[PDB]
């Protein structure tokens, strides 16, 4: 299968493009599916806010997108149901909407004639892959699966590491994260969250994150152990996960970070700094997370003690490249 | 006829709220539609982003709001005609949704109960009003009515002293802005305008504004002599208008910079200063504009002349103070 | 009665004056000195972006302001032993420079002539004040006194409840921190930091804090069971910590809320919310901490047990409602 | 020589060397001449949060950097007069500190063993030139010179092909600006400059610049005949220049875009668009100057036209790709 429809030509949606086509994928994006008309999906993947000009040509047709003189359809189906995809034969759907993250709401690609769907978020119980965490759960007969959240692609590899080398008996994440479209730009009503409706490049603000609560998924053990949460500020994209863990073994920084160091060592999903970074250069990273030794903290009081591990990621294009990595592997069972 | 209603609960509703407490006006809010519980009504209420906590209790029950200990009714129609106005005899409607800015739009409410709408943005050629400008063209059978935007608030009263004093033969408007609500946070759709799609709080964004366009409707003898336009930029709330003009007079800087004082001098709804402000010193003004002084230029080359007057705006509150004063007229004819 | 002094009129030097004329405090400012004219420090004590117009007239002649009609002297002297406090008596020095955050720096107000320094900032092994936790080891005896960090006035409420009524074994604190003046606007040199270096307003920057590690300044019991440090994010105020505990007892969260309600009650040092605010909403607290019941939670794995609590602060103005109240003590001994 | 030195290793300074480093120049840069160490200038240089990390190999030595294998001397001095340039043969000073805009203090580079100086900025009655409008003005025997201001490089090619075509007979320029290092983080202090003393990334900020004022240097024909100013807004780089004009002909919209497209066509310095862009598009442009036809507007009644004409730039590499035009064409003469 190597036949791709986008549902959704969102901030993901827009970069699993851009990324299939910077690795040179021999995928072939067929189909898109927005709300929109293919002027304003051209506009909007031709000028990027965080990452600046589509690398490639980008043209339109009053049902179509050009891009890299390569012809993709593009809709306007609110209810994936109704989704044309047999029309192309978009054989692996990359589900980017948001409104579909669960297997019996992903059926309507299947439904609407798509085989495969991968969705972009957190999707309950079903599998959840983490690319070189877990994606050799991964088989032929699996249909609709889930790559989970950006912060859920920053902990697991950091929180597979930890677990590996020493045990994480519990533990509890903050996420101080990028805002997102999911949040409002003046205060006012956002569903039932209040939270979220308030104005999110002016405030730091708490925000629900199931990655910590649904680790379970990616890495059974730790099925249980962990909570947390987020707080997101007012920048663009470029987030930072930090893990406060009771270990199974006493530990010292350097100890903690040698560990690391060895995980992400020939790791194109997982990477590792001792640079003195800030969120900005993580902006354009082709990891899943980087780990940053520089942050590690050991507070010991006898046999206590509170291991604090930090990994950076870009939330959107970082996310991205795990996605394309596992989507190029369902793509090949 | 001191009994109001309020439809939509936004940036510009809750503030009217705000507003007419602070007055302690005698027209009493005993109404509010908008699209929510009344439980999120209150909470954003009680926090607002950029104006701090409401200075009364804020306080709700499954259907109103109790404010400084009153009760107001909260509505959830998102047709006007919809809305039970006529339950605790909302007279005149408050009209801040955005989506009844025309005179057929508007006449739902009347439809729905009401006797009179005041419209919180530009609707068209119907009566509009900048309170100090010509609110004495207000009389007693104007049904619905509009008081122009924020920006229309800003340049008038400056287009109105300058047009007394010298005369204006032609000119041209740009306002730096603040972003609203009817921009985006992340770079996605935002109806049809391409510009409008772009992360609000990352970018400057040119806008087209009708201010310029339709000054005629507030000022007479300046029909279709200006032009102009927005560029919207990230600051939450505070604005400013320059207007560059050919002016019917030869002129120095103080000369402009004292007609210009002596208009506002008693003047309720224009401000003046010469200290050299920023936008959030605008923020919470009880003016709808304030001239400038500082930055005042002429441009002269022999005859020809270009003259470049300033004025800021809180394109929130101080808007909101003059939709309020425009309000207590309207409900007092 | 006492008259005052304030070394460094900045954020926090000029809000200090401001809330010292809100309280109507019998301490008269008498002396201020920084590094610039009277016309540049009346421009910026009238005009704040953080908090609006000044609440009283403010004026300025070539040597002094004058500020609701009375005077006060100005200095620019750079080094503090040649400020010439006896000209006016001023008799407490409010140090806020950032320059002089140890008794023997501070001395130097002792040899110019002042009898007693509060700092505004931590200071090596002094006596270290939060008020409401520790102000009654304050005694005629002392003349150079600390009121610690922001961050420290935030967690010390909440770690000395957390330690009376559970113990606290081991902790880690994160702040997710306004970005301050010892940042930077644009990269570029800031002394030895590298972090610090980074624009600020654009980036999520890792910054080191001692509020955590040296706690026992503060609370003795907890000398050396604490560490932390902050991510400075782009707000311009408004703070937020979360504490990571192991206690000495098990816990629910509701019983941890109950415990930190009862602790804040009758309190004005430190305030609880039950309600969803988010960072703006903590702008011009009175309050030098403000317990968020909402964010409580507790991650449980046999008898393993990790304790998240989080409060908010206002760093520039509720702070300073701290260091004012510890000054009217220190003051009156 | 091809041999040059960096005064000022800043935001300008640091993209002198990369934009050289791109475009493969012949120029050796062999000195850098700022305020701190090695480390620091290398971790700036390294990683940039407008342009992320920088694309060639950094690393440093106790008095050098060793960038893309080739070692640079840092030096430390202050003051001009005392950089060592003779020690690795700098002849040309890339003048980028911001304190030797005359050519009476960068005279002291000569004193100090080089050549020649171009200096980053407008820098009084000199030779100052805009690439593809004035470098053909420079010649063998100037010594001291500048390439003026951002906003100079984006508002001299627009003007120059307005006045071609149809003259300028005045006009009137605002330019919506990004925050500089000139500004102020949070609200203190800058030396005389009220308005820079102002938070800058929270604020609309009117500034001066002699953009228009100068621009006789760069077109005399036009010396006398502009003025305008800045509004400096919270983007970080990337703005927008706006010019109001009476023109010496009666014009068509369609008109002035296709005079802006022909001197645009094969123009290396000067860019056009047609698409709807926003700020964010402009940054890393290769341009001095992208002029923008969708905002073109022409305001006429009767007899009289104001028409407005909008041209982007970089202001921090677009300007820089400008500078370095012309210090390769400086340094072969
Ligand atoms: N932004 C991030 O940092 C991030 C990171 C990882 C995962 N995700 C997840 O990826 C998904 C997309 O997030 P995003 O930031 O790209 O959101 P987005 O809001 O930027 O994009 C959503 C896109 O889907 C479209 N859309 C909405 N409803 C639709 C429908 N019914 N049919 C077709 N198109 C529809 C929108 O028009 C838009 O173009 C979400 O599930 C999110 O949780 C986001
Ligand atoms: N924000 C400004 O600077 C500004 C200034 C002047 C005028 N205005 C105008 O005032 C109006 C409101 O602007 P705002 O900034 O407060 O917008 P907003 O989006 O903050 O508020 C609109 C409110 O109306 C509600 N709403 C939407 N559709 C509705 C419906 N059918 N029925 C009931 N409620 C509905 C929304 O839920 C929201 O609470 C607009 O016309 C706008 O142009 C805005
Ligand atoms: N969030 C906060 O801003 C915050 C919170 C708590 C404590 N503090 C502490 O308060 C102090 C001041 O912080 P700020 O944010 O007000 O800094 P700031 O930079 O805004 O103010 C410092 C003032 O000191 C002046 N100054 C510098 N050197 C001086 C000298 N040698 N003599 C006289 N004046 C001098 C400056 O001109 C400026 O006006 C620091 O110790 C800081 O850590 C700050
Ligand atoms: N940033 C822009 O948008 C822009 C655009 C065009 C021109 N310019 C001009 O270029 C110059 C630099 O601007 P910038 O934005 O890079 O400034 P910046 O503040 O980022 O950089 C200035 C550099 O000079 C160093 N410095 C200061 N004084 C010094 C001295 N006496 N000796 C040696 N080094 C010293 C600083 O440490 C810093 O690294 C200014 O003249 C400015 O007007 C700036
Ligand atoms: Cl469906
Ligand atoms: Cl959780
Ligand atoms: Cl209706
Ligand atoms: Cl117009
Ligand atoms: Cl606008
Ligand atoms: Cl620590
Ligand atoms: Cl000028």
């Known amino acids: ?14 970069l699993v493009l851009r990324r299939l086509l ?5 995928i072939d994006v067929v189909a898109i599916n927005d709300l ?35 012809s993709i ?24 909407t948001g409104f579909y993250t669960s297997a019996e709401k992903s059926q309507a690609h299947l439904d609407a004639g798509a085989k495969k769907v991968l969705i972009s978020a957190p999707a309950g119980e ?19 699966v889930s790559v989970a959240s950006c912060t859920t692609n920053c902990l697991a590899p950091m929180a597979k590491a930890l677990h590996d080398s020493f045990g994480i008996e519990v533990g509890t994440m903050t996420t101080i994260h990028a805002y997102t479209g999911t949040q409002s730009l003046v205060d006012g009503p956002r569903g039932k969250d209040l939270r979220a409706s308030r104005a999110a490049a002016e405030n730091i603000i708490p925000h629900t994150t199931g990655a910590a609560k649904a680790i379970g998924l990616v890495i059974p053990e730790l099925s249980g152990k962990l909570k947390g949460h987020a707080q997101r500020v007012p920048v663009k994209t470029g987030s930072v996960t930090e893990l406060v863990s009771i270990l199974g073994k ?4 350097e100890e903690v970070n040698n560990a690391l160091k060895q995980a992400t060592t020939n790791n194109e999903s997982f990477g590792y700094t001792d640079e003195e970074i800030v969120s900005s250069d993580i902006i ?5 997370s980087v780990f940053d030794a520089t942050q590690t903290e050991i507070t010991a009081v006898g046999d206590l003690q509170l291991v604090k591990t930090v990994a950076w990621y870009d939330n959107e294009y970082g996310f991205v490249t795990q996605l394309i990595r596992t989507l190029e592997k369902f793509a090949k069972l």
Chains 1, 2, 3, 4 share one sequence.
């Not at 965080?50 to 890299?68: A, H, K, M, Q, R």
């Open 1 to 14: 299968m190597s036949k791709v429809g986008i549902n959704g030509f969102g901030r993901i949606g827009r």
């Open 22 to 26: 910077e690795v040179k994928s021999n």
């Open 36 to 70: 929109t008309s293919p002027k304003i999906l051209a506009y909007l993947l031709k000028h990027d806010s965080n990452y600046g000009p589509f690398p490639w040509s980008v043209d339109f047709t009053e049902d179509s997108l050009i891009v890299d003189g390569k």
């Open 73 to 96: 359809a593009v809709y306007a189906e609110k209810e994936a149901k109704n989704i044309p995809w047999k029309a192309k034969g978009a054989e692996i759907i990359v589900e980017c």
């Open 126 to 144: 079903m599998k959840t892959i983490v690319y070189n965490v877990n994606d050799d759960t991964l088989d032929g007969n699996d249909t609709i």
């Open 250 to 253: 006493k530990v010292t920084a």
């Open 284 to 288: 354009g990273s082709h990891f899943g």
